Amino acid sequence: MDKINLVCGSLLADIGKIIYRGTSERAKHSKLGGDFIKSFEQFRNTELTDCIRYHHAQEITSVKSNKEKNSLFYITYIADNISSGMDRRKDLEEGAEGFNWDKKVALGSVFNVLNEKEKGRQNYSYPFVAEPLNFPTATQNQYTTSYYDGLITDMKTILQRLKPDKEHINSLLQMMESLWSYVPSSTDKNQLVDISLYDHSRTTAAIASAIYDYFQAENITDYQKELFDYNATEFYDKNAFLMMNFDMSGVQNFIYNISGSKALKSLRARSFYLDMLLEYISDNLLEKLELSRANILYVGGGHAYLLLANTNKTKAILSDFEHDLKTWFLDKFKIDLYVAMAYTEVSANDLMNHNGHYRDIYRRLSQKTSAKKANRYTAEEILNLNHQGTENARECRECKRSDLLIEEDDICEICDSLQKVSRDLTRENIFVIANEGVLDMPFGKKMSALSYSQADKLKKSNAEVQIYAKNISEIGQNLMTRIDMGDYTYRSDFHEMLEEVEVGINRLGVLRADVDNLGQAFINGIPDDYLSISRTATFSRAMSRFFKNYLNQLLAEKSYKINVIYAGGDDLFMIGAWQDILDFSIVLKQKFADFTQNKLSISAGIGMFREKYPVARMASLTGDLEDAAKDYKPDERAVQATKNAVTLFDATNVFSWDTLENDIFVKLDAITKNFEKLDETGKAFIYRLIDLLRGVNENQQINIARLAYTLSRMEEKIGKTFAQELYNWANADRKTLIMALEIYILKTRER
Amino acid sequence: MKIIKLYFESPVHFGEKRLSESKITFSADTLFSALMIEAVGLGKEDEFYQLASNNLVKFSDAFPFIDQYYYIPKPMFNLKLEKEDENPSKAFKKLLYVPIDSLEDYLSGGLDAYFERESFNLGKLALSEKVQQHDFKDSEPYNVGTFTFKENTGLYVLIEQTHPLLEELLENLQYSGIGGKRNSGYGKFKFEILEDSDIEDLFSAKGNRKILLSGALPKDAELEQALKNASYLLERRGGFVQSDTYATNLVKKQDLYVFKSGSTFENSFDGDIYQVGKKGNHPVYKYAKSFFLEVSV
Amino acid sequence: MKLVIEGTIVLKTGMHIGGSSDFSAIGAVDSPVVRDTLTRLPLIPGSSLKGKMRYLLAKELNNGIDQDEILRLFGSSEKDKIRRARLKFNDIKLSNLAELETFNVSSTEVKFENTINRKTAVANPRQIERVIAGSKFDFEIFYNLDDIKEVEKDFENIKQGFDLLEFDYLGGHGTRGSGRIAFENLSVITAVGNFEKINTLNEILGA
Ligand SMILES: Nc1ncnc2c1ncn2[C@@H]1O[C@H](COP(=O)(O)O[C@H]2[C@@H](O)[C@H](n3cnc4c(N)ncnc43)O[C@@H]2COP(=O)(O)OP(=O)(O)OP(=O)(O)O)[C@@H](O)[C@H]1O
Ligand SMILES: Nc1ncnc2c1ncn2[C@@H]1O[C@H](COP(=O)(O)OP(=O)(O)OP(=O)(O)O)[C@@H](O)[C@H]1O
Numbered sequence A: 001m002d003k004i005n006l007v008c009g010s011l012l013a014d015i016g017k018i019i020y021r022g023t024s025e026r027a028k029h030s031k032l033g034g035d036f037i038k039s040f041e042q043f044r045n046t047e048l049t050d051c052i053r054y055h056h057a058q059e060i061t062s063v064k065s066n067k068e069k070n071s072l073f074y075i076t077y078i079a080d081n082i083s084s085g086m087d088r089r090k091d092l093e094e095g096a097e098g099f100n101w102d103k104k105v106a107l108g109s110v111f112n113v114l115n116e117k118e119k120g121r122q123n124y125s126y127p128f129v130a131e132p133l134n135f136p137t138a139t140q141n142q143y144t145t146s147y148y149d150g151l152i153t154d155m156k157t158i159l160q161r162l163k164p165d166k167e168h169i170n171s172l173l174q175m176m177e178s179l180w181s182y183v184p185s186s187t188d189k190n191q192l193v194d195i196s197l198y199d200h201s202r203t204t205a206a207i208a209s210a211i212y213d214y215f216q217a218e219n220i221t222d223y224q225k226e227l228f229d230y231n232a233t234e235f236y237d238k239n240a241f242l243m244m245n246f247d248m249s250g251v252q253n254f255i256y257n258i259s260g261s262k263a264l265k266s267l268r269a270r271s272f273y274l275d276m277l278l279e280y281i282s283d284n285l286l287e288k289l290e291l292s293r294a295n296i297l298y299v300g301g302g303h304a305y306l307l308l309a310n311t312n313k314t315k316a317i318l319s320d321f322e323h324d325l326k327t328w329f330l331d332k333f334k335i336d337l338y339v340a341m342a343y344t345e346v347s348a349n350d351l352m353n354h355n356g357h358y359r360d361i362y363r364r365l366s367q368k369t370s371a372k373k374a375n376r377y378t379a380e381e382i383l384n385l386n387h388q389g390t391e392n393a394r395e396c397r398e399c400k401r402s403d404l405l406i407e408e409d410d411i412c413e414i415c416d417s418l419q420k421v422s423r424d425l426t427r428e429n430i431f432v433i434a435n436e437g438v439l440d441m442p443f444g445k446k447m448s449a450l451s452y453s454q455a456d457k458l459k460k461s462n463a464e465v466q467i468y469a470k471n472i473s474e475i476g477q478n479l480m481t482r483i484d485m486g487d488y489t490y491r492s493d494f495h496e497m498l499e500e501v502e503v504g505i506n507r508l509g510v511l512r513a514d515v516d517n518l519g520q521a522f523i524n525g526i527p528d529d530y531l532s533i534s535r536t537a538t539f540s541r542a543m544s545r546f547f548k549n550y551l552n553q554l555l556a557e558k559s560y561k562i563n564v565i566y567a568g569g570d571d572l573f574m575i576g577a578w579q580d581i582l583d584f585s586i587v588l589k590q591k592f593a594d595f596t597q598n599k600l601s602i603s604a605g606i607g608m609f610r611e612k613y614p615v616a617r618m619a620s621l622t623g624d625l626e627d628a629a630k631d632y633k634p635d636e637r638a639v640q641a642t643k644n645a646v647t648l649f650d651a652t653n654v655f656s657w658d659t660l661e662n663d664i665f666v667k668l669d670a671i672t673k674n675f676e677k678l679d680e681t682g683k684a685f686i687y688r689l690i691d692l693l694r695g696v697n698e699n700q701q702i703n704i705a706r707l708a709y710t711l712s713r714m715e716e717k718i719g720k721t722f723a724q725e726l727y728n729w730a731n732a733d734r735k736t737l738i739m740a741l742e743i744y745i746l747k748t749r750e751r
Numbered sequence B: 001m002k003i004i005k006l007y008f009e010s011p012v013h014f015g016e017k018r019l020s021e022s023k024i025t026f027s028a029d030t031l032f033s034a035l036m037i038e039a040v041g042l043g044k045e046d047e048f049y050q051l052a053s054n055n056l057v058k059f060s061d062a063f064p065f066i067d068q069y070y071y072i073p074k075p076m077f078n079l080k081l082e083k084e085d086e087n088p089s090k091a092f093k094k095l096l097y098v099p100i101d102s103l104e105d106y107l108s109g110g111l112d113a114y115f116e117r118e119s120f121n122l123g124k125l126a127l128s129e130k131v132q133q134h135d136f137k138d139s140e141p142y143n144v145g146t147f148t149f150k151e152n153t154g155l156y157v158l159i160e161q162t163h164p165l166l167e168e169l170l171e172n173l174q175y176s177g178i179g180g181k182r183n184s185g186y187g188k189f190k191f192e193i194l195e196d197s198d199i200e201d202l203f204s205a206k207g208n209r210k211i212l213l214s215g216a217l218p219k220d221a222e223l224e225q226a227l228k229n230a231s232y233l234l235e236r237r238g239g240f241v242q243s244d245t246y247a248t249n250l251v252k253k254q255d256l257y258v259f260k261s262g263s264t265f266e267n268s269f270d271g272d273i274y275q276v277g278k279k280g281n282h283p284v285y286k287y288a289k290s291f292f293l294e295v296s297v
Numbered sequence C: 001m002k003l004v005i006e007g008t009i010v011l012k013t014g015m016h017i018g019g020s021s022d023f024s025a026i027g028a029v030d031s032p033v034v035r036d037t038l039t040r041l042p043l044i045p046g047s048s049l050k051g052k053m054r055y056l057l058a059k060e061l062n063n064g065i066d067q068d069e070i071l072r073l074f075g076s077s078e079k080d081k082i083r084r085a086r087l088k089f090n091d092i093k094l095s096n097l098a099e100l101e102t103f104n105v106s107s108t109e110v111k112f113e114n115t116i117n118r119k120t121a122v123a124n125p126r127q128i129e130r131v132i133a134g135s136k137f138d139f140e141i142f143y144n145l146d147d148i149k150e151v152e153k154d155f156e157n158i159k160q161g162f163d164l165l166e167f168d169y170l171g172g173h174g175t176r177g178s179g180r181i182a183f184e185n186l187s188v189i190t191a192v193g194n195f196e197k198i199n200t201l202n203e204i205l206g207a
């Protein structure tokens, strides 16, 4: 039995669900999906049919006599069971003509269950549209048959130009991610629906693939007896899977610690290079293990999670892979960048939460990751590091390294390759990984950012080229691997970018938004009762898609002067117009609140910099402002910090996002509306107020004197309503008034 | 034992790789470089190298002190015995320096995580925008990363068996500054050898886990012994050789990778003074001997 | 072997050194002065004094006719002629706060200036934060006795540089009236070692 057939039958497993909810007869959905696949002439090997029509307990009981051993459809069943987690194991199938199945429900956001111990219980949903991202909605939404038929028509269009082959499994995942991302895995009430069909099918395929590899390595050809003839409790207790912990270390130091004259143009290139490194390493490992991309759980933030098979051959491949990757990274990034690979022996009960400590997988994974991150190198790599040391005269301008130095310039191979790519990084661009390229990649490859037009003439039947694209259309033909990241570049020069404002300031504003307690939201935020591999994967992919895709779409919605450097996961870096940073901070907070249903806190930090300020210093200052926002507490009595704050140009100026920021923005809008049109001569009192309120712990005489002067000022004007509202807001809100006034001044300064 | 307290009268630049940023402490190789430069100044570099290479003067690096609270970089414990309670997460990640008397309390748990960081406040990093004025060309704006300490705050160096020659060198190092832009208005301090009593007990103690207190590189013989159940971290110690009598131009030195001053080991190793400048006409040395603080988990 | 050169800098016409870009308003101080990072007291950075004194000496000892004197006194690293230093300048903190507080007056002033267009005859009011006149800056300069023969020439050049600074400015818009200074209490006392000719070095600065 071929593995590709198993992967295809585990992926295209619940197509019958959509074909049943859409149109046609109302029979059991497995038969409908099997017929739908059989209608195509290329998915004809009867193994796809066995996996699709027979992946539930009742079907297996109904055909176990006809189908002989090693029939390949026990693996998909025992994989769907693990993917479901706490969900049904033996129950009536969808559309069994025995229950009025609620064939109109949409999948809710997994933020309904998130932090239900202290943030309540709700049931939201994703409305159907036509990308773009669907925010959770308070109103109850129902999916229409027309949406189902559109999905069916697009699926029939795509699957016609598809094959059950290794190179087309990626296109199958792309089609599933595009279409099924917003349709539920199950359609009923009194249970949970938030598990998407894309996540469910991808997890099922990954589990089935790992189980097949483990069975093949252990030389087992008794799938029925091991899995279905009994409760499979023996297989459940024993360990069969692994979970890798690819963790790239020192990304911040590799990216931000630079000192070039054109360094601002390079941070996007550095972040893109690191994301490409991580994704290419994950894909190459998956190829080495003869595994599809369904086995990848999460990629982003220099962190990859893969679900492997616990076989001695797999562990040997992992050891050799780690040796090769460590040697390559040592060759390129001596210690300035390093990836730690650690895997934990995980059984089926651990993922399916039978023991009640599913989180122990990640506990021991983090323990092994930290252990390898401490004793990183053996006492031969250190000898090589200290012996490959040479006294030099020249060094890299940014990377400040004397090896890998280009002959004609004081710039390092990395240090000019990720300037050529930054020059060549535009929109409607794809990314290729061929033996000839511009950016170095491990395992003797290189990557380029060539346009889609040159892609056709680039392949020329070159076996593997690893085409990477930001956008995917016509999924079936022109196989490509879709990669997402922050790629909103209104203008990539940062000087004409800044000199587009007419009234404002000549400062460079930046944003560093970090989600608060996301690690805790993973450790204990998700309920223990609702703990599953599919649900965790759904939450992870929802957060990653939110960040990358929706940051891109939100910036592309209308004209924003932002040149986003990094989105990835749990983090955010932005450089653009100062007022654009300020007015997009509120957009970011409101969009995060809407998408996460006010369950996860976020913190930011904004800094003003000149046109030639050190970008490493920019990043370090914005990071320590971000920390000053992270350590915010209204009162010094409760344990731990609220973390829900924003620092506005100063570490000491820790404001909030709550009613406090509401007040500061209401004040800013009121001041902007009122103080545009003065007598244009009495406005000189504004700097008087600013410099006499800069700090009030000293001679108070001048403050009450200015109060008396404001009272004294008497002519025909707006009156003294707002002229005394200034006094009213001048006592209760001191720091608030100075902050709002300085924001107003910077916005309205004739500079 | 012999806490050398350094009181700075001007902001310091203790740069790590570039001039635009400064770090708050200097390492032991920086201090040995400064003292070797002084010894070359008064003509006894050979005796100083003999003393330091015969372990007669071995020192840790510079740690912060605040109001007679001697601080130490967060030791790299395996944290295998704390997952039961407290916060085995990023709470103990922003914490950079812990006090050295409260280490056994921290090691066994019970030290506040949030409280320390605001308690740990010694000055702040500063920008220093400078230029190279050119009469007719354009001026060259550059900035120097600096750091100013508080009034009752500075750095302290652990030295075992202080030496008359070392005392003579530290007098000369007052007036030549320490750090990056010392000939500019930045490096400046006064020191006190300041024998201490509650500290020598910590280094007269015993225990299974050893805390490396100086950026050290093991000898080729004991690297295998030291790299067993160790939680360490490497760091490149390179840059440019600071001497006007070396290689007749501005040449870099062989980058050396050493264990950081917060690493923890089960096997005590004695590091080495490393020849990192060979092609020049004087031996450029990297002080990488080992200075430990044994604890028991 | 180490000499420390004490003395005081007295501001005569108000001085504006340095630019720290932060906290600007519509009126504002359009250009602030350098201050201590913690105490916020104004200071003369050792780099500013060193550079202006080196400028005056280099343009004096040469006159369009660096030299050995300037390179040996301030250092050099250009391409081959690497000379280390003999002078070690320090940041100079504002000494006069006890005296300046008796006048109930701040250590800094905001000077109001404008430029008038010559075509449209339209003014433009700029504000320049300035350290007030009469402020004193006691300093210290460390000199390393690398060579015992050249000490007299080096200290003659140091006194000459101080004298040139007396008839010049130190920071900011000097030709527009700012930044005049003076020196007094100029003494050199050996700090480490023993120089028997410290009397003639004090007489060099005393002159
Ligand atoms: N599924 C899963 N993924 C990741 N970690 C998981 C999971 N289950 C359990 N755990 C445990 O959580 C912590 C995570 O710590 P860490 O390894 O430092 O990893 C980073 C990052 O890789 C990861 N991350 C970022 N973005 C995502 C997304 N979209 N999906 C999954 N994982 C993601 O979380 C960590 C980010 O660290 P911080 O940003 O510093 O955390 P914080 O919220 O900002 O804290 P604070 O500063 O606000 O206080 C491990 O123990 C792991 O076993
Ligand atoms: N390509 C990238 N560009 C920008 N930021 C990234 C990129 N990849 C990852 N990051 C983020 O930078 C954060 C810090 O990563 P980094 O490895 O430098 O520190 P760390 O998490 O403490 O790990 P370690 O202690 O091993 O160095 C990460 O959490 C990640 O989200």
Ligand SMILES: [Mg+2]
Pocket (backbone or CB within 6 Å): A247, A248, A249, A250, A302
């Ligand atoms: Mg990491």
Ligand SMILES: [Mg+2]
Pocket (backbone or CB within 6 Å): A514, A515, A516, A517, A518, A519, A570, A571
């Ligand atoms: Mg986070």
Ligand SMILES: [Mg+2]
Pocket (backbone or CB within 6 Å): A514, A569, A570, A571
């Ligand atoms: Mg993060």
